[PDB]
Ligand binder design. Structure first.
Ligand code: MET
Ligand SMILES: [Mg+2]
Ligand SMILES: [Mg+2]
Ligand SMILES: [Mg+2]
Ligand SMILES: [Mg+2]
Lengths: 124, 137, 92
RNA sequence: AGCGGGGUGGAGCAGCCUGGUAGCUCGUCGGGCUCAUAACCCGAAGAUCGUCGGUUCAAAUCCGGCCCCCGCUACCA
RNA sequence: UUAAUUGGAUUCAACGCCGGGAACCUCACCGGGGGCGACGGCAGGAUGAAGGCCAGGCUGAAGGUCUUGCCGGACGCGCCGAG
């Protein structure tokens, strides 16, 4: 009842080159990794590695909704912009291979009211 | 003073004896709980049915004029029938005018005593069902 | 949004009497035959059952008054939530 | 108090007597016609019969006990 | 309904219409961050105005600003009109 991703434990995923890991992800993630990371993602990754090393005792806030979750990011809490505020996300092992934006909804759930004037033919 | 009508709350005896005539008129004894009974005053229940207007009051064969606290009197009323309209042991309330209540609470505040204020307060509490005026008293 | 200031108070429209005359029930438990000023009569449509501000006439201030402002749905909802007025006054 | 009558969609009435589909008119919601409203046309929702029991192959229908409503009469403090 | 769900058009003669198949741009909306005042005049200014930067904080990221001191020589939005 441990975690496995394609028959690998978490540690085996930790000690992998970015290329070796890219062969396990779905096609969209593989193409995104092969084409390189954008500069903003580079800065975010630098901050993440610093925080893991034992420095940067501050919360991580980022505008990068298109960043792919990587195994070395597991255990940290990231604040992802949803359009008007930063929401906390706690990265769990079963999130590997997803974009960050999937965990920060940008619209509010709809609870309908009573239909107003002009909602039907007879109300006009 | 003559324009306003004094409040009053009474309760029918659960005794069969006090009923001396059923309809046209309804003759039944009564004891006063609070307030003052006067002739020509409409009575209503909690739900407000018009039981009619008190036609006459008599403590004995003699003709009376009014009844104060702690007095028993047989009322001959019109429009009230035992059973469908009134039941023995049921509590009856005097219908009140809001203008009369305002006059009593503001103008004629000198001539108000314990039984009168208790009756008026509980009548307002009971009548606080439809008009928020009695809810705010 | 504006609140009564002075002798003004709320009111609920009960029935329109024609020729710019309404019948408004106020907060002091009185029914008043109220007159609508023509300035707002032309541009604001009033219908039975609305929260409005009424100023009684200086002479005989018990049955006559003037309606000065109408409360929209958002304003009356905000007032109900704030608690300045209750629900049973509006619903009767 | 005694006697007589009655409870069925939101409303007012059939369907009983002769047990075996719960209908009629208005009303609400939706679509039609008209530049727009009313009138008119179409479709759908809505009672399982005041409750409880007995009878019957089977009960709103036959029977009985309760709850409520209506009418007539006796009834003078 | 919403932080915003940008606006115009309502019988024929509005409703795959605005050549309107909007990921960015378009874009007019919402949250946040930056920049701009010919020409006149006032403060000020080579005892250097205005302006620009290696590193490091602040930050979504930013010599934008701050810390740390280096670079540049003549105009000046800190003030009033005007554009
Ligand atoms: C009349 O008969 C009388 N005894 C009835 C009661 S008086 C309260
Ligand atoms: Mg029509
Ligand atoms: Mg629109
Ligand atoms: Mg598209
Ligand atoms: Mg866009």
């Amino acid at each position: 009842k441990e975690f496995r991703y394609r028959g690998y434990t978490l540690e085996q995923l930790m000690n992998m080159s970015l290329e070796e890991l890219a062969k396990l992800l779905p096609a969209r993630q593989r193409r995104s990794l092969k084409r390189g990371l954008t500069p903003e993602q580079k800065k975010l990754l630098r901050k993440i590695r610093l925080a893991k090393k034992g420095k940067y005792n501050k919360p991580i806030r980022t505008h990068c909704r298109d960043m792919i979750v990587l195994p070395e990011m597991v255990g940290l809490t990231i604040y992802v912009h949803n359009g008007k505020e930063f929401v906390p996300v706690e990265i769990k092992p079963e999130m590997i291979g997803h974009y960050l934006g999937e965990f920060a909804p940008t619209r509010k759930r709809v609870q309908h009211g009573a239909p107003g004037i002009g909602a039907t033919r007879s109300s006009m | 003073l003559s324009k306003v009508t004094f409040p009053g709350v009474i309760r029918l005896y659960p005794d069969e004896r006090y009923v001396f005539r059923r309809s046209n008129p309804a003759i039944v004894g009564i004891e006063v709980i609070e307030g003052r009974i006067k002739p020509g005053v409409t009575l209503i229940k909690q739900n407000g049915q018009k039981v009619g207007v008190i036609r006459s009051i008599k403590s004995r064969d003699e003709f009376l004029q009014e009844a104060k606290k702690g007095q028993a009197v047989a009322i001959a009323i019109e429009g009230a029938i035992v059973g469908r309209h009134i039941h023995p042991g049921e509590t009856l309330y005097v219908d009140l005018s809001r203008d009369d209540a305002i006059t009593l609470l503001k103008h004629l505040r000198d001539t108000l005593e314990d039984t009168d204020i208790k009756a008026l307060k509980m009548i307002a509490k009971v009548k606080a069902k439809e008009d928020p005026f009695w809810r705010a008293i | 949004v504006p609140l009564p200031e002075g002798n003004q108070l709320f009111g609920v429209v009960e029935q329109a009497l024609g020729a710019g005359w309404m019948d408004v029930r106020c907060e002091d438990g009185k029914i008043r035959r109220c007159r609508i000023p023509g300035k707002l009569r032309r541009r604001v449509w009033i219908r039975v059952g609305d929260l409005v501000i009424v100023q009684p006439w200086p002479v005989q201030s018990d049955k006559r008054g003037d309606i000065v402002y109408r409360y929209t749905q958002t304003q009356v909802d905000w007032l109900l939530r704030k608690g300045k007025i209750t629900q049973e006054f509006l619903t009767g």
